[PDB]
Design an enzyme around this catalytic site. Structure first.
Site, PDB file in Angstrom:
ATOM      1  N   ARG A 112      -6.022  10.856  -0.470  1.00  0.00           N
ATOM      2  CA  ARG A 112      -4.958   9.732  -1.179  1.00  0.00           C
ATOM      3  C   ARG A 112      -3.678   9.770  -0.340  1.00  0.00           C
ATOM      4  O   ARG A 112      -3.131   8.677   0.228  1.00  0.00           O
ATOM      5  CB  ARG A 112      -4.978   9.580  -2.579  1.00  0.00           C
ATOM      6  CG  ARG A 112      -3.601   8.804  -3.215  1.00  0.00           C
ATOM      7  CD  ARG A 112      -3.534   8.522  -4.615  1.00  0.00           C
ATOM      8  NE  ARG A 112      -3.816   9.731  -5.207  1.00  0.00           N
ATOM      9  CZ  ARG A 112      -2.917  10.826  -5.499  1.00  0.00           C
ATOM     10  NH1 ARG A 112      -1.841  10.905  -4.928  1.00  0.00           N
ATOM     11  NH2 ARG A 112      -3.278  11.834  -6.350  1.00  0.00           N
ATOM     12  N   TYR A 134      -1.861 -18.017   2.851  1.00  0.00           N
ATOM     13  CA  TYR A 134      -3.039 -17.587   2.140  1.00  0.00           C
ATOM     14  C   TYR A 134      -3.090 -17.583   0.685  1.00  0.00           C
ATOM     15  O   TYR A 134      -1.804 -17.170   0.131  1.00  0.00           O
ATOM     16  CB  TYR A 134      -3.692 -16.412   2.791  1.00  0.00           C
ATOM     17  CG  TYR A 134      -4.830 -15.713   1.895  1.00  0.00           C
ATOM     18  CD1 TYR A 134      -5.843 -16.553   1.594  1.00  0.00           C
ATOM     19  CD2 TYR A 134      -4.575 -14.469   1.309  1.00  0.00           C
ATOM     20  CE1 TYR A 134      -6.637 -16.125   0.612  1.00  0.00           C
ATOM     21  CE2 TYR A 134      -5.447 -13.867   0.449  1.00  0.00           C
ATOM     22  CZ  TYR A 134      -6.529 -14.845   0.096  1.00  0.00           C
ATOM     23  OH  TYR A 134      -7.672 -14.617  -0.766  1.00  0.00           O
ATOM     24  N   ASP A 140       2.323 -11.410   8.619  1.00  0.00           N
ATOM     25  CA  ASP A 140       1.037 -11.328   8.427  1.00  0.00           C
ATOM     26  C   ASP A 140       0.277 -11.728   9.681  1.00  0.00           C
ATOM     27  O   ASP A 140       0.314 -13.163   9.936  1.00  0.00           O
ATOM     28  CB  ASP A 140       0.584 -11.925   7.223  1.00  0.00           C
ATOM     29  CG  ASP A 140      -0.860 -11.839   6.769  1.00  0.00           C
ATOM     30  OD1 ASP A 140      -1.563 -11.676   7.621  1.00  0.00           O
ATOM     31  OD2 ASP A 140      -1.468 -12.082   5.569  1.00  0.00           O
ATOM     32  N   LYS A 198     -11.255  -8.851   8.823  1.00  0.00           N
ATOM     33  CA  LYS A 198     -11.128  -9.980   9.463  1.00  0.00           C
ATOM     34  C   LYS A 198     -11.358  -9.617  11.030  1.00  0.00           C
ATOM     35  O   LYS A 198     -12.546  -9.049  11.028  1.00  0.00           O
ATOM     36  CB  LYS A 198      -9.956 -11.050   9.418  1.00  0.00           C
ATOM     37  CG  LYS A 198      -9.544 -11.390   7.883  1.00  0.00           C
ATOM     38  CD  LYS A 198     -10.657 -11.550   7.100  1.00  0.00           C
ATOM     39  CE  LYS A 198     -10.010 -12.008   5.793  1.00  0.00           C
ATOM     40  NZ  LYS A 198     -11.130 -12.074   4.424  1.00  0.00           N
TER      41      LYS A 198
HETATM   42  C1  LIG Z   1      -3.841 -14.360   6.423  1.00  0.00           C
HETATM   43  C2  LIG Z   1      -4.407 -13.486   5.318  1.00  0.00           C
HETATM   44  N1  LIG Z   1      -3.733 -12.344   4.820  1.00  0.00           N
HETATM   45  C3  LIG Z   1      -4.067 -11.704   3.944  1.00  0.00           C
HETATM   46  C4  LIG Z   1      -5.464 -11.716   3.420  1.00  0.00           C
HETATM   47  C5  LIG Z   1      -5.888 -10.770   2.237  1.00  0.00           C
HETATM   48  O1  LIG Z   1      -6.883  -9.804   2.911  1.00  0.00           O
HETATM   49  P1  LIG Z   1      -8.216  -9.128   1.956  1.00  0.00           P
HETATM   50  O2  LIG Z   1      -7.509  -8.438   0.921  1.00  0.00           O
HETATM   51  O3  LIG Z   1      -9.091 -10.115   1.769  1.00  0.00           O
HETATM   52  O4  LIG Z   1      -8.602  -8.195   3.041  1.00  0.00           O
HETATM   53  C6  LIG Z   1      -6.328 -13.090   3.781  1.00  0.00           C
HETATM   54  C7  LIG Z   1      -7.737 -13.177   3.225  1.00  0.00           C
HETATM   55  N2  LIG Z   1      -8.259 -14.293   3.482  1.00  0.00           N
HETATM   56  C8  LIG Z   1      -9.790 -14.615   3.304  1.00  0.00           C
HETATM   57  C9  LIG Z   1      -9.864 -14.471   1.639  1.00  0.00           C
HETATM   58  C10 LIG Z   1     -11.157 -15.076   1.053  1.00  0.00           C
HETATM   59  S1  LIG Z   1     -10.654 -15.743  -0.765  1.00  0.00           S
HETATM   60  C11 LIG Z   1     -10.634 -14.402  -1.806  1.00  0.00           C
HETATM   61  C12 LIG Z   1     -11.092 -14.458  -3.134  1.00  0.00           C
HETATM   62  N3  LIG Z   1     -12.145 -15.488  -3.712  1.00  0.00           N
HETATM   63  C13 LIG Z   1     -10.044 -14.163  -4.013  1.00  0.00           C
HETATM   64  O5  LIG Z   1      -9.909 -14.661  -5.144  1.00  0.00           O
HETATM   65  O6  LIG Z   1      -9.179 -13.560  -3.521  1.00  0.00           O
HETATM   66  C14 LIG Z   1     -10.106 -16.113   3.683  1.00  0.00           C
HETATM   67  O7  LIG Z   1      -8.863 -16.978   3.806  1.00  0.00           O
HETATM   68  O8  LIG Z   1     -11.165 -16.522   3.879  1.00  0.00           O
HETATM   69  C15 LIG Z   1      -5.808 -13.622   5.046  1.00  0.00           C
HETATM   70  O9  LIG Z   1      -6.469 -14.815   5.216  1.00  0.00           O
HETATM   71  C1  LIG Z   2      -5.274  13.922 -14.638  1.00  0.00           C
HETATM   72  C2  LIG Z   2      -5.369  13.033 -13.451  1.00  0.00           C
HETATM   73  N1  LIG Z   2      -5.203  11.749 -13.555  1.00  0.00           N
HETATM   74  C3  LIG Z   2      -5.086  11.132 -12.305  1.00  0.00           C
HETATM   75  C4  LIG Z   2      -4.966  11.913 -10.982  1.00  0.00           C
HETATM   76  C5  LIG Z   2      -5.034  10.823  -9.637  1.00  0.00           C
HETATM   77  O1  LIG Z   2      -6.303  10.715  -9.359  1.00  0.00           O
HETATM   78  P1  LIG Z   2      -6.226  10.479  -7.655  1.00  0.00           P
HETATM   79  O2  LIG Z   2      -5.770   9.243  -7.059  1.00  0.00           O
HETATM   80  O3  LIG Z   2      -6.194  11.946  -7.074  1.00  0.00           O
HETATM   81  O4  LIG Z   2      -7.935   9.957  -7.531  1.00  0.00           O
HETATM   82  C6  LIG Z   2      -5.205  13.345 -11.171  1.00  0.00           C
HETATM   83  C7  LIG Z   2      -5.230  13.956  -9.761  1.00  0.00           C
HETATM   84  N2  LIG Z   2      -5.266  15.284  -9.752  1.00  0.00           N
HETATM   85  C8  LIG Z   2      -5.325  16.054  -8.731  1.00  0.00           C
HETATM   86  C9  LIG Z   2      -4.589  15.594  -7.770  1.00  0.00           C
HETATM   87  C10 LIG Z   2      -4.057  16.677  -6.370  1.00  0.00           C
HETATM   88  S1  LIG Z   2      -2.256  16.428  -5.750  1.00  0.00           S
HETATM   89  C11 LIG Z   2      -2.184  15.124  -4.752  1.00  0.00           C
HETATM   90  C12 LIG Z   2      -1.275  15.259  -3.500  1.00  0.00           C
HETATM   91  N3  LIG Z   2      -0.683  16.043  -2.657  1.00  0.00           N
HETATM   92  C13 LIG Z   2      -0.128  14.010  -3.922  1.00  0.00           C
HETATM   93  O5  LIG Z   2       0.906  14.069  -3.281  1.00  0.00           O
HETATM   94  O6  LIG Z   2      -0.324  13.183  -4.543  1.00  0.00           O
HETATM   95  C14 LIG Z   2      -5.222  17.825  -8.852  1.00  0.00           C
HETATM   96  O7  LIG Z   2      -4.567  17.691 -10.217  1.00  0.00           O
HETATM   97  O8  LIG Z   2      -5.711  18.662  -8.221  1.00  0.00           O
HETATM   98  C15 LIG Z   2      -5.349  14.160 -12.227  1.00  0.00           C
HETATM   99  O9  LIG Z   2      -5.401  15.198 -12.375  1.00  0.00           O
END
Ligand SMILES: Cc1ncc(COP(=O)(O)O)c(/C=N/[C@@H](CCSC[C@H](N)C(=O)O)C(=O)O)c1O
Ligand SMILES: Cc1ncc(COP(=O)(O)O)c(/C=N/[C@@H](CCSC[C@H](N)C(=O)O)C(=O)O)c1O
Ligand SMILES: Cc1ncc(COP(=O)(O)O)c(/C=N/[C@@H](CCSC[C@H](N)C(=O)O)C(=O)O)c1O
Ligand SMILES: Cc1ncc(COP(=O)(O)O)c(/C=N/[C@@H](CCSC[C@H](N)C(=O)O)C(=O)O)c1O
Lengths: 387, 387, 387, 388
Positions: A48, A101, A173, A198
């Site tokens: 993460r 977008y 963007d 893309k």
């Molecule tokens: C300039 C720009 N910045 C950012 C993004 C976002 O990137 P992503 O998170 O998709 O990777 C896009 C995406 N564009 C796609 C999205 C499809 S529509 C989505 C869907 N039904 C919804 O309901 O959302 C497109 O135009 O074909 C983007 O054209």
């Molecule tokens: C009860 C609960 N809810 C939620 C989460 C979050 O889930 P994830 O996003 O990791 O999937 C955890 C995570 N726990 C791990 C995280 C390690 S420390 C991370 C790092 N160095 C940082 O700086 O973050 C643990 O205790 O060993 C969780 O114990």
């Protein structure tokens, strides 16, 4: 010599495995990393926060964009979300383009209605509209050039220096062209972001985002916020994206040859009312695109003669353009933005963007030019038979 | 209209998902498939026998090569193995080229020592040698053109017609050029096979093979032996390989641009004794290669002046050519056949083939021409500084 | 002290990544590995010959089996194929069991018809049959215990010592019980092999094989033939398979609890004519199974009263037993060997084996005993309602 | 009957492929899906919004937890982020536990400093502290039971009915036990969330999160917000996570057998000052855990006699407990929370949580109990050598 863009994309992660000298980089799926005995964090501790496979993709996108580092997110919208969380707080104003977008509009209008910041939507192609927005001392300006789906071109040097004079950060963007074809950080932007979904991945089989900051301190704020919000992406997705990136130069050569040819077909054809493609000499922004871009890309949209019935006749029968969302793939696509990509907008915000109910958008793939034109011509006959 | 080879490869399994309409094909890892009640096998039952992700790659290579079908194996040596087992039994004779891939030499020579077939090793580019081999009534003739690593060119039409006149089947190893640059089945061959590990995949991250038969009866036999011997490949590997294939036409344009520029630097450079590249007019086979290939490819080998000291100074310091086995990837590679790719051969078999101890082989990738040429010039200097 | 089999399997390649200290092992897909300058092969050079992800799985199965090393193949049939090529040549004789897996029967009979070796098909549970086969000086004896699908049990110590007396090598197919429940090398066998597709993987999402040799020289021979024939597995498949192994001991506890509960329901149920499960004291082989196995496993077959109509009513309606080939997964399966797993056999080889047309085979998964027993009881009524 | 928890998890996506009848479900990596001709969206359109492979994992976790649907996120923290965004706005107050995961604390404190909501950090094991916090009319209460890393047990019926009386939504972080061992929605919670990184995936090779809502409308708000914020997970991660889920019951049988054995060694061993493990009869919350959980789990922490030197000697030499973050894997792990998992917290927030600088946390794997005890005993010798 430092290498070119093409060499850097091709060699990203090549011969960089200290364990076996694998040429192709190993996939580090591990959630966790051992300590080197009590009190001794290694370079990595937890995926993460930081992952070597994800960081090869960050490092490569940073090298390509000229920035201090890159953060890879689970989605494109997630990169935009990251920037809004790392930079803005309540009382801050954000300026966004009117024709961004539809998913960006959706996120900007949702978070503004909660009070996370104040929102000014402006026409950045338009000096008056920009100066009224910059008179409100915004913390952040977002540019999307060329714009989705009308390919409006915004003057990066103009808008970025106007925003520096009033103390605003800039984020661009750069999805629609990729780092191979536009480097917003060269123009002074603080941040450049992408949907890797893309052209960077190119194979329509990963959703991803990246954010590159020019400055090392802002890069570290982005790393911190990505970790804290859990917006970071999967190492397997970063592996496929890095694999995709290696053919970005080779793919864009063909995308752009195919797009120049399809632009020639649609410009001046009897059945086509307007074409929007920056490579056309008559497109507003042509000269700007020619100076700020290294190519006109392969996105275009166009308006047919003959209303709804012509659109329906054109689309149903396309053999080589799949009717589907997304873009930037090796495979050619077609979209009706009003009802698909930009359906998250209100009919009012669309009207203000100039996205009509008859607009079709092409994402031109790397299939044989001769086959894409046979497909488009049969489409144009089908729409003519409609009159 | 049918589409071109490039369109077919870009679109293989695009929008061919009956479950959800996925644009990209779903990966079917499943070892097993439900029956549709007692006695009702579906299309697939067990992945060693048949799997849909693997069959997309099978059907794609068969379309590209002009065959009735394709079988995907765990490796390229596996595809050769499958053909020897499906076609030959003890008392049959096999004719092979003298300068075939060292691993081909190792397998032919090991299975001949055990007496699975009788082996004749002929020079297929010399008519006397060929006629003496065909006079011994062989079941199967294998051609490898161009040859690894000296790029000797064998006349597909000549040898294939000569082999039909005596009732031999012909199989061609088409690894060095891929289906995008040579189609042996067009000239009458019964079987073409590949190491998909090379250009077809293109990303040096899958070892695999393919066999395509012209005739449906011979394809049904290869499917049976591949299942019975357990030679079939993994679906994940077919998935990556198919993803690779989509950029094959795009990759080979840049490969060939770079190979032309590098052949020109090496040919009549003072430090270079001989270049083997079929693109040079002085290469024995040039005009045959211009006739039976769509291009001259991107593999070449060369001898340096100045013995083993010069080779070592040339190789140690290369930044963009990785010293490694394999070929056909986006990244540039260098090998030393005697100690690496052709180490499996005896010293007499390398001498009979004309593989010296000073030979270097280049796999030229798709980096920028200029970065590869700077890298090779620096090497030629270091070799020169040795005299 | 060393750790147990279970500890070793759970921890295979845990904290063994020199690059990053990844807890889980990185996936090395790379086809190739750089040299450490001219003339300096690293540990690995080419994935068909050796790959570190595949060798964690090989090294783990060799620790569990007590062997000098292991080779991972693309399929289970491929591991048998590897052993036949490494060990046999024309003139050598192979003794196989009469009730081996139909796929084994298909390969032995096809390679025997070509004359790669002579074939003696014996009943290894009956001493006269074994003595007459050993009196013919065989190079190799193959044992499959328990047998698929009648769960016949062959005395490992008796057959192996008898085969050493006449100079024969022994290979045991240990697929049905895995290394967690039976260790043939402890009784002196030369080779143990598996379909990793079954219990070792356990998730029905990889087809693979493994051969483990007791002696280092025979292991080096299997490595050589696996590379030369191209029979080696995908590193991705080795990664999923290793991930599977980690829950093998945990999975088999629940498999055996469920199988016990189900053998008790089926044995002297009015609708059931015979159960073949080595866990029942009435099964010929039970006391041998209790001695040479740590447990009775989770494979069983049975004959219903009421002929074909009863089998059909029983199978059509099962909710939790999927009708499919394969076995050893977390999900419960049912098969009809005559028409499915053992269709490759002639009707005559099936009669000689005692595989009737009314036989059903269960693979019992790790679902709740109560949900599997409700499901079987409902089948037994549907079959009752047929009379 | 409907099926048990174990059967549901094992059969998740089994025989559910209309294209070929694959037993094991296909991985749908596709970012996009074709329309059925002009104007005709299919069930899926775009993976960021919805993906069939991800939906198998969402569906299965919703079946296991008893909720209307599930949303799968790129991380656990991302699941928490999704909930704060879908439910809170400025002017809203959020109640959180004092002894929550230091990552949760980091995010609560960071977003509260920006003004996204007002934060109240309470001791939910302690009725006066809870009632002072509910007097402030909060929009949302979060419970993390058992707590990371002191295993404090919070009374789900008590806290959830106290919060309903004042109109607050409830969300429970159920990472530490999984759905196989605690079903907070049975106690009336609006929302349960997980780091799927831990027991659900089980193999330390996916980071992931999930949120399940009791009510269909709140599930629809989560789907919307996940799509809009781009918090959704990768389909390949959802494939490996669904694959791990299939062994959740069988893994927990061995995790719990191994943890009962290790609790027995550490409780009243001369080198151990304090053990925190809900399955010990002397642990505060034992009777509550016996009642609101179906098992005591495999997470425990403990404090050694002999200061920093004893900790350093114990840890250096462990053969079968890797010193690393995370938990819930088949492989056994040890962590020093002050300097690792809870290093994101301030020394005052830790002091307030009662996380001392000498606390060691075990995630107990599915290795042979005999090997884990040989390893822990040699570690306790090594720490003893440190006094004399
Ligand atoms: C300039 C720009 N910045 C950012 C993004 C976002 O990137 P992503 O998170 O998709 O990777 C896009 C995406 N564009 C796609 C999205 C499809 S529509 C989505 C869907 N039904 C919804 O309901 O959302 C497109 O135009 O074909 C983007 O054209
Ligand atoms: C009860 C609960 N809810 C939620 C989460 C979050 O889930 P994830 O996003 O990791 O999937 C955890 C995570 N726990 C791990 C995280 C390690 S420390 C991370 C790092 N160095 C940082 O700086 O973050 C643990 O205790 O060993 C969780 O114990
Ligand atoms: C024309 C042809 N047909 C078939 C094949 C076989 O295909 P694969 O099985 O590798 O996919 C090849 C391979 N050629 C590679 C591999 C050398 S590896 C030596 C290795 N240590 C070993 O001992 O083998 C090359 O020359 O670089 C091939 O050039
Ligand atoms: C004891 C043993 N050794 C070896 C193997 C081979 O291992 P794999 O190659 O499959 O991994 C098996 C496999 N057995 C499976 C497969 C039946 S498939 C029929 C198929 N249509 C075909 O034509 O083959 C079974 O009985 O279900 C095996 O029981």
């Amino acid at each position: 010599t430092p290498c070119t863009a093409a060499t850097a994309a091709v060699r990203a992660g090549i011969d960089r495995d200290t364990a076996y000298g694998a040429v192709t980089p190993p996939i580090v799926l591990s959630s966790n990393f051992s300590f080197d005995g009590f009190g001794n964090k290694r370079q990595y501790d937890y995926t993460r926060s930081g992952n070597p496979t994800r960081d090869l993709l960050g490092e490569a996108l940073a090298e390509l964009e000229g920035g201090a580092g890159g953060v890879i997110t689970s989605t494109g919208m997630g990169a935009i979300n990251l920037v809004l969380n790392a930079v803005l707080q309540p009382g801050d104003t954000l300026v966004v383009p009117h024709d961004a977008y539809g998913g960006s509009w959706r996120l900007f209008n949702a978070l503004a209605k909660k009070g996370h910041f104040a929102l000014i939507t402006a026409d950045l192609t338009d000096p008056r509209s920009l100066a009224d927005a910059l008179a409100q001392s915004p913390k952040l300006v977002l540019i999307e050039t060329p714009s989705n789906p009308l390919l409006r071109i915004t003057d990066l040097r103009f808008v970025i220096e106007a925003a520096k004079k009033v103390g605003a950060l800039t984020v661009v963007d750069n999805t629609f062209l990729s780092p191979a074809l536009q480097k917003p950080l060269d123009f002074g932007a603080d941040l450049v972001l992408h949907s890797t979904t893309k052209y960077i991945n190119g194979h329509s089989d990963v959703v991803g985002g990246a954010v590159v900051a020019r400055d090392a301190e802002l890069h570290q704020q982005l790393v911190w916020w990505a970790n804290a919000l859990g917006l970071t992406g999967s190492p397997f997705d970063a592996f496929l994206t890095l694999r995709g990136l290696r053919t970005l130069d080779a793919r864009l050569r063909v995308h752009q040859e195919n797009a120049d040819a399809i632009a020639e077909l649609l410009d001046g054809h009897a059945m086509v009312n307007q074409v929007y493609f920056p490579g056309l000499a008559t497109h507003p922004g042509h000269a700007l695109a020619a100076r700020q871009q290294k190519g006109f890309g392969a996105m275009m949209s166009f308006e047919l003669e003959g209303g709804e019935a012509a659109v329906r006749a054109f689309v149903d029968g396309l053999r080589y353009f799949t009717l589907a969302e997304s873009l930037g793939g090796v495979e050619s696509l077609i979209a009706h933005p009003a009802s698909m990509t930009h359906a998250a907008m209100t009919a009012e915000a669309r009207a203000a963007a100039g996205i009509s109910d008859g607009l079709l958008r092409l994402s031109i793939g790397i299939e044989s030019a001769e086959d894409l034109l046979i497909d488009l011509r049969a489409g144009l006959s089908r729409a003519e038979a409609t009159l």
